[PDB]
Write an enzyme that holds these catalytic residues in place. Structure first.
Site, PDB file in Angstrom:
ATOM      1  N   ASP A 121       0.833  -1.193   0.000  1.00 36.41           N
ATOM      2  CA  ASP A 121       0.000   0.000   0.000  1.00 36.41           C
ATOM      3  C   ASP A 121       0.871   1.248   0.000  1.00 36.41           C
ATOM      4  O   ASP A 121       1.782   1.379   0.822  1.00 36.41           O
ATOM      5  CB  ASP A 121      -0.920  -0.005   1.220  1.00 36.41           C
ATOM      6  CG  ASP A 121      -2.200   0.768   0.993  1.00 36.41           C
ATOM      7  OD1 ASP A 121      -2.951   0.417   0.061  1.00 36.41           O
ATOM      8  OD2 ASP A 121      -2.463   1.723   1.754  1.00 36.41           O
ATOM      9  N   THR A 134      -3.611   5.170  -3.781  1.00 33.06           N
ATOM     10  CA  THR A 134      -2.625   5.911  -3.003  1.00 33.06           C
ATOM     11  C   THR A 134      -1.265   5.936  -3.688  1.00 33.06           C
ATOM     12  O   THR A 134      -0.509   6.897  -3.522  1.00 33.06           O
ATOM     13  CB  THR A 134      -2.503   5.309  -1.607  1.00 33.06           C
ATOM     14  OG1 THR A 134      -2.356   3.889  -1.711  1.00 33.06           O
ATOM     15  CG2 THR A 134      -3.746   5.619  -0.797  1.00 33.06           C
ATOM     16  N   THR A 135      -0.929   4.890  -4.442  1.00 34.42           N
ATOM     17  CA  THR A 135       0.311   4.909  -5.207  1.00 34.42           C
ATOM     18  C   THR A 135       0.202   5.802  -6.435  1.00 34.42           C
ATOM     19  O   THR A 135       1.190   6.426  -6.833  1.00 34.42           O
ATOM     20  CB  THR A 135       0.697   3.490  -5.623  1.00 34.42           C
ATOM     21  OG1 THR A 135       0.628   2.621  -4.486  1.00 34.42           O
ATOM     22  CG2 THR A 135       2.108   3.460  -6.184  1.00 34.42           C
ATOM     23  N   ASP A 143      -8.711  -2.430   1.234  1.00 32.47           N
ATOM     24  CA  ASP A 143      -8.773  -1.734  -0.049  1.00 32.47           C
ATOM     25  C   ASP A 143      -9.948  -2.235  -0.880  1.00 32.47           C
ATOM     26  O   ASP A 143     -10.718  -1.442  -1.441  1.00 32.47           O
ATOM     27  CB  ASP A 143      -7.461  -1.921  -0.812  1.00 32.47           C
ATOM     28  CG  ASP A 143      -6.369  -0.988  -0.335  1.00 32.47           C
ATOM     29  OD1 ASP A 143      -6.611  -0.223   0.621  1.00 32.47           O
ATOM     30  OD2 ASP A 143      -5.267  -1.019  -0.920  1.00 32.47           O
TER      31      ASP A 143
HETATM   32  N1  LIG Z   1      -5.271  -6.874 -14.603  1.00 30.84           N
HETATM   33  C1  LIG Z   1      -4.638  -5.689 -14.770  1.00 30.84           C
HETATM   34  N2  LIG Z   1      -3.997  -5.395 -15.920  1.00 30.84           N
HETATM   35  C2  LIG Z   1      -3.364  -4.223 -16.098  1.00 30.84           C
HETATM   36  N3  LIG Z   1      -3.313  -3.255 -15.167  1.00 30.84           N
HETATM   37  C3  LIG Z   1      -3.915  -3.417 -13.966  1.00 30.84           C
HETATM   38  C4  LIG Z   1      -4.625  -4.672 -13.695  1.00 30.84           C
HETATM   39  N4  LIG Z   1      -5.122  -4.572 -12.450  1.00 30.84           N
HETATM   40  C5  LIG Z   1      -4.759  -3.358 -11.964  1.00 30.84           C
HETATM   41  N5  LIG Z   1      -4.038  -2.672 -12.867  1.00 30.84           N
HETATM   42  C6  LIG Z   1      -3.481  -1.311 -12.681  1.00 30.84           C
HETATM   43  O1  LIG Z   1      -2.870  -1.188 -11.396  1.00 30.84           O
HETATM   44  C7  LIG Z   1      -3.113   0.115 -10.867  1.00 30.84           C
HETATM   45  C8  LIG Z   1      -3.393   0.033  -9.375  1.00 30.84           C
HETATM   46  O2  LIG Z   1      -2.260  -0.496  -8.694  1.00 30.84           O
HETATM   47  P1  LIG Z   1      -2.269  -0.706  -7.099  1.00 30.84           P
HETATM   48  O3  LIG Z   1      -0.870  -0.486  -6.581  1.00 30.84           O
HETATM   49  O4  LIG Z   1      -2.983  -2.004  -6.821  1.00 30.84           O
HETATM   50  O5  LIG Z   1      -3.199   0.466  -6.502  1.00 30.84           O
HETATM   51  P2  LIG Z   1      -2.854   2.027  -6.680  1.00 30.84           P
HETATM   52  O6  LIG Z   1      -3.972   2.543  -7.550  1.00 30.84           O
HETATM   53  O7  LIG Z   1      -2.841   2.558  -5.270  1.00 30.84           O
HETATM   54  O8  LIG Z   1      -1.514   2.028  -7.368  1.00 30.84           O
HETATM   55  C9  LIG Z   1      -4.313   0.678 -11.601  1.00 30.84           C
HETATM   56  O9  LIG Z   1      -3.999   1.963 -12.137  1.00 30.84           O
HETATM   57  C10 LIG Z   1      -4.598  -0.287 -12.730  1.00 30.84           C
HETATM   58  O10 LIG Z   1      -4.579   0.421 -13.970  1.00 30.84           O
END
Ligand SMILES: Nc1ncnc2c1ncn2[C@@H]1O[C@H](COP(=O)(O)OP(=O)(O)O)[C@@H](O)[C@H]1O
Ligand SMILES: Nc1ncnc2c1ncn2[C@@H]1O[C@H](COP(=O)(O)OP(=O)(O)O)[C@@H](O)[C@H]1O
Ligand SMILES: Nc1ncnc2c1ncn2[C@@H]1O[C@H](COP(=O)(O)OP(=O)(O)O)[C@@H](O)[C@H]1O
Ligand SMILES: [Mg+2]
Ligand SMILES: [Mg+2]
Ligand SMILES: [Mg+2]
Lengths: 532, 528, 260, 172, 52
Positions: free
Chosen positions: B61, B94-95, B391
């Protein structure tokens, strides 16, 4: 696991540190670029004060720890040694190139591709400069040299007085002109002896139609002005004779000691008699002269100067036609001094300059020589005038040797940026980004000039780029290639018409050196720092 | 500058002013963004932080990582603050917010270095953010049918997308279904305290379960507790806030007697008070007794004699969940233990879970609470699982509030960047450069995804730009296939409000950072 | 790092190796016969493959440079006052003796210089001496009047390389100094490297020796050192071609074939 | 309590980093200790790194003297300034005892120190010069006293004259 | 520098195995001239396999 007694940096960390060091070195001197630039004060740990605008001097005086910063400092020093001008622009361009290349690398572009793109961009920039942006100086005349000197002395302590200082510089350089084998007109700068003396204002700085010595007559009995000077240049001391290490005096008959002691000084006496018998009036020697020989010169009504610098003596001998004699030995094993080894001058005087005296060998024959006496408010001002004067002399020498000049005020940079950003689309797939970044990095010079002028840098550089793009696209608008920056009014201006020139060699060498330095730094991706 | 014997500010005050301090602030923001840079995406990696006491925190996170970082730089604290804001309002992204803000600052740094007035950059950011938020609201996909099956599928897909970046991403479908089921049983307010989360050491992730009721750990049973039955098939539950043990009637009470008969009467009266409370509880009909206050050994043995289960010192939140699941009322007085104030569940049982004893209240048909029982090999494993489920729960709650979804994987940001570049190509030109820089900075997230996955970022970026330019809205990064794909058809869904809040917070942080021209640091007082 | 300048460096390395060995009946290459000179300044593109030798020593006989049709002579004795290996003193007990001492010293120096000149020599190399003065000011003046380039402070270990390059046979006593021991050369000139130092180039020698010299230029010292290392690597590769003349593909092909 | 033949073996080569760091620090203190011990006991009985690397550097053919002082020190400082103005070739300098951290006896009874270095060795260790020199003697007296032992070394331009190797060539 | 022998000999390695690898690179430089990095990498991989 490594078990290496030292610190290690790898990957993005070391690249970022190198780029930060280069950018710090750039930011150190970015405030002394262009006529609106301002000088800096360097203070030692013992209180010594240095005021200068030259980038090479500033980088030499500073203490530098990071190896990349050392690379940039030595790059500035090399640019000063090989050209003499543009020592700040080269550092700024190299730092900007390194920053943009590092950004490309952070974009997961391999550094080898960036290096190849930088090499191609540098080659094409040199070719485009040599083929389109050069101006031949044959049809411009002395005004070209005057304008080049004035441009070189802008951003210096002698900027506003350029109308007079440029005349002085051009006259001196043309005076020290000579021709060599194969008919190449060579201009040996550093033959102009730059003399400093505080006191009256800058406009009273004197250009000597001859040579100036920073030394006075040995004795107060000698005359301090000779009209028809027959200069005798010597490379041996005139003092009591002393036997060498392998020769020893052992006396068994006491009656011969007085004769020995008399001959000891009579040898030097007869040497001086031989020298004076030919009509010599001024005698200059690198060695010392003791009291009796000074009296010998006094009685003959002739000058005698001791501890003359070797380079000064060589210049005087070359200008006046005299030859330096390290010994009075001919090809038949005798002591002699013919009149042929005597130089001649129109007048030799010991002038007083601000409670101090110096010798002026005026209007030497068989060769024209020049010297400059700089008058300033204090010592630091005189030193800065000397540095700026040397830069101007180097610029004039470059312009006279190679008869091509280019417009100043960032016009060359903008034209190169436009041409390179248009050309990058033609070759390669990953090198095109490198060439585009090279073109973008070339724009740091006009941006820095505008920032120093406290003008709208973005709008001014946009107008410059639009002008140069119109020049390159429209084939009937070739006259816009000279559109530079008018820093006083903050508007684009035809710099070639306005008289803002600089040698093409300055830009070419700056580009080549900056590209090589950026390439050298860019190969580094790992650092090992062993503990001492 | 002169010593000036009498000085204006306190000695030791540090002041930084001008362009260099703004450049340093931007660089500090980039440094902060780099510390959480690699935690984004399904190929993201966790970070381990050790405090002074030696405790280690492992988390993917962004908000948690930034909190554990002890930032002291005044400009860098803004990124941590906006990460906390995104966590509070949304719970995911948050990232992304820190990366977006840092990329904005990086893009506008060259213009700052060349003397551009900060107000122009601030105005450009405000305009670009307004346009981007309007575009997100316009192009977000919503279904106005209120069909249960498709709305449930949308919740599950959003949960999986929010979960497919953590160490539980291998079981993302299982946990997503669990989370959606848990959220759907919350009544009206979706209070987070209504979803119990219990972490039990030992066991695989697939061994974790969701309880349709309430479950809590055994709480310091007294003597005679093991003699009580540990399973009931239709118990009535007495939720009490009562101390059932022999004790002084009041702290200030004093008993004054002058006869041995009165002494015996007093001791018998104390025993009769306790036994009367217990007798009222017994004839209340309840078989399970729970209390906030301690239940003594005498009461424990009394309940064992009647074949009842008792548990004292139950935590307040656990009793609240039990009340909301079984459907009773917490009673401070046992005088009126009516039928309606008694909880009821189909099955109560005490079972061992990984070396611990847990009380289970299952079979509640009208429960409004839940209980997550998480299993794992280490306490940090359960901690990260709880963070990931938090989350997912926040994402599901937001989706419940409004089912407006946009495709993830950077597709939404490609569409926004293309729209912003198209808009910037139709303005005078001073704001055009800044809006173009904003659009270029919007590409950071897909580029970071490709970098984390080990792709070639430039080729994927070029393909995405070409695909979006000639038509196609939901084309983003496909991690598994080494290429790009339509993420909407790939069920990579994100609530639109997540990206709206991300853009708003990043823009506000960038504007606040740019608007600062001077930094002043007074000397510390009472350093100790 | 010299991959960009490879187009110039690789033919230079190949020519350097080929010009130092016989292409036929050769089993090894002595790389110490290829001298590498590192001069700061310029770019890597300014590297040169001078066929003769370049000496970093400056010309003592200032005022004369670029001797054409040079007859180079290398001496190993000193041009100073007479001094035997035994400790020697000259005792004077009369003023006439005191004058005759320096008169005869001047005569002896003039005789040495005349003997050197009579052989037709016009460029003189003097080996470095640490016991007694190798070149006195009087000898320098006498040589200057006869228009002979004087180069002193020649390193002892460089004698073999210089003699191989030019063909001069070293002379240790003036008695054996004859014209047949001089090395004829086309031209010997001192050249300035754009204000970044001075180099003396002897290009064009009758019956050239089997030695070559590579001049390396660069912006800073680090790239010069790396260019020297890379050029040495290229020369070593060509040497590896000289002995055991077998070639294989690169690119990791031998390793993967070995693995399979 | 046996196994006197420990044979630490791999230990020293596996923890050589800390051992070498401690060795470097101890040696760094060692040069300072050796430099300061040349004054105490040897002559007393009868930043520090700046001083250390100033003594280590510079040519062995130039006489360099240093003065140890604590805050008639002012008169001797004035005489030293006068000598510096009279002997530009010399590099007169002074340093506090507390910076060096010398012994307490030197601080309490050896405040006036005239330490002369010539090539890294002490050719003169004049300490507590109050008795044999005085309290208010002028610079000429100190110059004569120091020159009597053969330790001190035996025109004026306008302001300055100093500034490729091509000096001047008129050859066609 | 990019030369394997120069990199290895320029940094003190303090470990007997690493010092022997440095000597190996020096020997390869003496005999062949290039491939100094490749031989060290080969030796490292060989010892990696030796571990298993
Ligand atoms: N199956 C997937 N394929 C491609 N990108 C993904 C997938 N699942 C999530 N993402 C990308 O990961 C990002 C979110 O990453 P994460 O670190 O879990 O949360 P945060 O939004 O806080 O970074 C989102 O912007 C999304 O576009
Ligand atoms: N009168 C002028 N008008 C516009 N530009 C100028 C003028 N004089 C000099 N410049 C430009 O300012 C730039 C900076 O020169 P400067 O920094 O003084 O030289 P250096 O780099 O040797 O210190 C030069 O590239 C030149 O083109
Ligand atoms: N153009 C190329 N394409 C593919 N492989 C190459 C190329 N050039 C060199 N190599 C390989 O790189 C390897 C490393 O060579 P190099 O780095 O020059 O010296 P070392 O072998 O000491 O590392 C060589 O084994 C060679 O096979
Ligand atoms: Mg200039
Ligand atoms: Mg997420
Ligand atoms: Mg190789």
């Amino acid at each position: 696991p490594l078990s290496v007694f030292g610190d290690r940096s790898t990957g993005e960390t070391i690249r970022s540190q190198n780029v930060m060091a280069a950018a710090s070195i750039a930011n150190i001197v970015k405030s002394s670029l262009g006529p609106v630039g301002l000088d800096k004060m360097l203070v030692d740990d013992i209180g010594d004060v240095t005021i200068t605008n030259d980038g090479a001097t500033i980088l030499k005086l500073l203490e530098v720890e990071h190896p990349a910063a050392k690379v940039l400092c030595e790059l500035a020093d090399l640019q000063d040694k090989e050209v003499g001008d543009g020592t700040t622009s080269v550092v700024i361009i190299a730092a900007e190139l390194l920053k943009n290349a590092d950004e490309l690398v952070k974009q997961k572009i391999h550094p080898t591709s960036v290096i190849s793109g930088y090499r191609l961009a540098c080659k094409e920039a040199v070719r485009y400069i040599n083929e389109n942006l050069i101006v031949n100086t044959d049809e411009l005349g002395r005004d070209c040299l005057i304008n080049a000197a004035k441009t070189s002395m802008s951003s210096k302590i002698i900027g506003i007085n350029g109308d007079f200082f440029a005349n002085m510089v051009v006259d001196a350089v043309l005076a020290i002109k000579y021709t060599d084998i194969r008919g190449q007109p060579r201009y040996p700068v550093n033959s102009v002896n730059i003399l400093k003396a505080h006191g009256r204002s800058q406009m009273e700085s004197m250009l000597i139609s001859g040579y100036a010595l920073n030394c006075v007559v040995g004795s107060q009995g000698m005359p301090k002005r000779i009209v028809n000077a027959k200069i005798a240049c010597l490379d041996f001391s005139l003092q009591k004779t002393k036997m060498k290490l392998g020769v020893q005096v052992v006396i068994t008959d006491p009656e011969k000691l007085d004769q020995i002691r008399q001959r000891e000084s009579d040898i030097t006496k007869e040497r001086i008699q031989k020298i004076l018998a030919t009509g010599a009036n001024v005698i200059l020697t690198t060695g010392g002269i003791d009291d009796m020989c000074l009296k010998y010169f006094v009685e003959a009504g002739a000058m005698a100067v001791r501890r003359v610098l070797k380079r000064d003596l060589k210049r005087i001998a070359k200008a006046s036609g005299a030859t330096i004699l390290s010994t009075l030995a001919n090809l038949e094993g005798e002591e002699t001094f013919e009149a042929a080894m005597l130089g001649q001058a129109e007048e030799v005087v010991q002038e007083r300059i601000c409670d101090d005296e110096l010798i002026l060998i005026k209007n030497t024959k068989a060769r024209t020589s020049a010297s400059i006496i700089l008058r300033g408010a204090n010592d630091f001002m005189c030193d800065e005038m000397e540095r700026s004067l040397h830069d101007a002399l180097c610029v004039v020498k470059r312009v006279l040797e190679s008869k091509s000049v280019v417009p100043g005020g960032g016009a060359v940079e903008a034209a190169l940026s436009i041409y390179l950003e248009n050309y990058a689309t033609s070759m390669g797939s990953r090198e095109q980004l490198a060439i585009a970044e090279f073109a973008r990095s070339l724009l740091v010079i006009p941006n820095t000039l505008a920032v120093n002028a406290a003008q709208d840098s973005t709008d001014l550089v946009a107008k410059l780029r639009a002008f140069h793009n119109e020049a390159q696209v429209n084939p009937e608008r070739k006259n816009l290639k000279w559109i530079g920056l008018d820093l006083s009014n903050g508007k684009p201006r035809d710099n070639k018409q306005a008289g803002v020139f600089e040698p093409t060699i300055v830009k070419v060498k700056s580009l080549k050196f900056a590209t090589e330095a950026a390439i050298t730094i860019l190969r580094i991706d790992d650092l090992i720092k062993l503990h001492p | 500058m002169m010593p000036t014997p009498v000085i204006l500010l306190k000695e030791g005050t540090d002041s930084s002013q001008g362009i260099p301090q703004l450049v340093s602030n931007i660089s500090a923001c980039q440094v902060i963004a780099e510390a959480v840079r690699t935690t984004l995406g399904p190929r993201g990696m966790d970070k381990l932080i050790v405090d002074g006491r030696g405790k280690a925190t492992i988390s993917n996170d962004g908000a948690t990582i930034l909190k554990l970082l002890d930032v002291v730089h005044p400009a860098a604290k803004t990124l941590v603050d906006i990460a906390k804001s995104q966590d509070a309002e949304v719970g995911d992204g948050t990232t992304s917010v820190t990366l977006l803000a840092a990329e904005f600052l990086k893009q506008v740094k060259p213009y700052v270095e060349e003397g551009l007035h900060p107000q122009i950059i601030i105005r450009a950011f405000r305009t670009a953010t307004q346009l981007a938020v309007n575009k997100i609201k316009e192009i977000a996909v919503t279904v106005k049918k209120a069909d249960k099956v498709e709305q449930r599928k949308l919740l599950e897909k959003c949960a999986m997308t929010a979960l497919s970046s953590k160490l539980i991403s291998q079981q993302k479908a299982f946990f997503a279904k669990m989370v959606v089921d848990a959220v759907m049983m919350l009544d009206d307010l979706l209070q987070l305290k209504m979803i119990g989360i219990k972490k039990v050491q030992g066991g695989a992730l697939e061994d974790s379960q969701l309880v349709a009721g309430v479950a809590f750990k055994k709480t310091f049973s007294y003597a005679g507790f093991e003699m009580q039955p540990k399973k009931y098939h239709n118990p009535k539950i007495a939720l009490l806030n009562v101390e059932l043990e022999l004790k002084a009637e009041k702290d200030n009470a004093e008993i004054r007697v002058h006869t041995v008969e009165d002494y015996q009467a007093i001791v018998d009266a104390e025993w009769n008070i306790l036994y009367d409370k217990l007798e009222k509880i017994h004839h209340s009909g309840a078989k399970v007794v729970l209390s906030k206050l301690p239940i003594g050994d005498v009461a424990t043995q009394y309940f064992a004699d009647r074949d009842m289960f008792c548990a004292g010192r139950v935590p307040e939140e656990d009793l609240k969940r039990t009340m909301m699941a079984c459907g009773g009322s917490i009673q401070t007085s046992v005088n009126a233990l009516s039928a309606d104030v008694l909880g009821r569940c189909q099955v109560f049982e005490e079972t061992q879970i990984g070396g611990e004893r847990y009380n289970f209240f299952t079979g509640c048909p009208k429960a409004k609470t839940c209980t997550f029982i998480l299993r794992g090999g280490a306490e940090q494993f359960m901690e990260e699982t709880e963070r990931s489920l938090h989350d997912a729960i926040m994402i599901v709650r937001r989706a419940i509030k409004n089912d407006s979804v946009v495709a993830g994987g950077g597709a939404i940001e490609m569409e926004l960047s293309k729209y912003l570049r198209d808009y910037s190509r139709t303005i005078p030109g001073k704001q055009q450069l800044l809006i173009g820089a904003y659009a270029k900075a919007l590409e950071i997230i897909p580029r970071q995804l490709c970098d984390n996955a080990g792709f070639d970022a430039t080729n994927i970026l070029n393909k995405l730009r070409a695909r979006h330019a000639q038509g196609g809205t939901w084309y983003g990064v496909d991690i598994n296939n080494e290429d790009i794909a339509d993420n909407f058809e790939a069920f990579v869904w994100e609530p639109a409000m997540v990206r709206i809040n991300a853009l708003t917070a990043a823009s506000e942080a960038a504007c606040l950072i740019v608007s600062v021209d001077e930094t002043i640091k007074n000397p510390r007082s009472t350093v100790d | 790092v010299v991959s960009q300048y490879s187009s110039l460096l690789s033919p230079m390395s190949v020519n350097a190796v080929m010009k130092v060995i016989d292409p036929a009946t050769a089993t090894s290459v002595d790389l110490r016969d290829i001298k590498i000179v590192k001069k700061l300044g310029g770019t890597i593109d300014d590297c040169e493959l001078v066929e003769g030798l370049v000496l970093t020593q400056k010309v003592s006989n200032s005022g004369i440079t670029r001797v054409e049709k040079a007859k180079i002579g290398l001496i190993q004795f000193c041009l100073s006052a007479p001094k035997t290996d035994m400790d020697n003193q000259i005792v004077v007990s009369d003023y006439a003796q005191m004058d005759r001492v320096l008169r005869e010293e001047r005569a002896y120096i003039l005789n040495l210089v005349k003997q050197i000149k009579k052989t037709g020599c016009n460029v003189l190399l003097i080996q470095k001496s640490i016991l007694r003065d190798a070149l006195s000011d009087l000898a320098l003046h006498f040589l200057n009047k006869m228009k002979i380039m004087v180069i002193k402070d020649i390193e002892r270990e460089d004698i073999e390389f210089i003699c191989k390059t030019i063909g001069t046979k070293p002379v240790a006593h003036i008695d054996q100094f004859t014209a047949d021991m001089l090395g004829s050369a086309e031209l010997a000139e001192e050249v300035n490297l754009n204000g970044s130092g001075k180099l003396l180039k002897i290009t064009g020698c009758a019956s050239p020796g089997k030695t070559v010299t590579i001049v390396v230029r660069g912006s800073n010292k680090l790239v010069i050192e790396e260019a020297e290392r890379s050029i040495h690597d290229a020369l070593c590769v060509i040497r590896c071609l000289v002995k055991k003349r077998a070639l294989i593909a690169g690119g990791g092909a031998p390793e993967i074939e070995l693995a399979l | 309590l046996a196994g006197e033949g420990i044979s630490v073996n791999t230990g020293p080569k596996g923890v050589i980093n800390d051992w070498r760091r401690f060795k470097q620090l101890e040696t760094e203190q060692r040069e300072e200790q050796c430099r300061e011990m040349e004054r105490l006991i040897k002559k007393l009985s009868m930043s520090g790194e700046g001083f250390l690397d100033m003594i280590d550097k510079e040519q062995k053919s130039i006489v360099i003297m240093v003065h140890i002082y604590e805050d008639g020190t002012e008169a001797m400082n004035g005489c030293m300034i006068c000598l510096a103005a009279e002997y530009p070739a010399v590099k007169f300098c002074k340093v506090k005892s507390s910076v060096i951290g010398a012994s307490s006896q030197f601080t309490r009874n050896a405040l006036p120190a005239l330490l002369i270095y010539k090539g890294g060795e002490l050719i003169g260790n004049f300490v507590r010069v109050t008795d044999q020199l005085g309290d208010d003697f002028f610079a000429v007296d100190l110059e004569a006293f120091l020159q009597e032992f053969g330790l001190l070394p035996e025109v004026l331009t306008s302001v300055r004259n100093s500034a490729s190797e091509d000096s001047d060539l008129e050859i066609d | 520098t990019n030369d394997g022998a120069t990199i290895l000999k320029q940094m003190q390695v303090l470990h007997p195995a690493a010092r022997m690898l440095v000597e190996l690179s020096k020997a390869q430089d003496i005999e062949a001239g290039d491939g100094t990095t490749s031989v060290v990498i080969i030796a490292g991989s060989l010892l990696d396999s030796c571990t298993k």
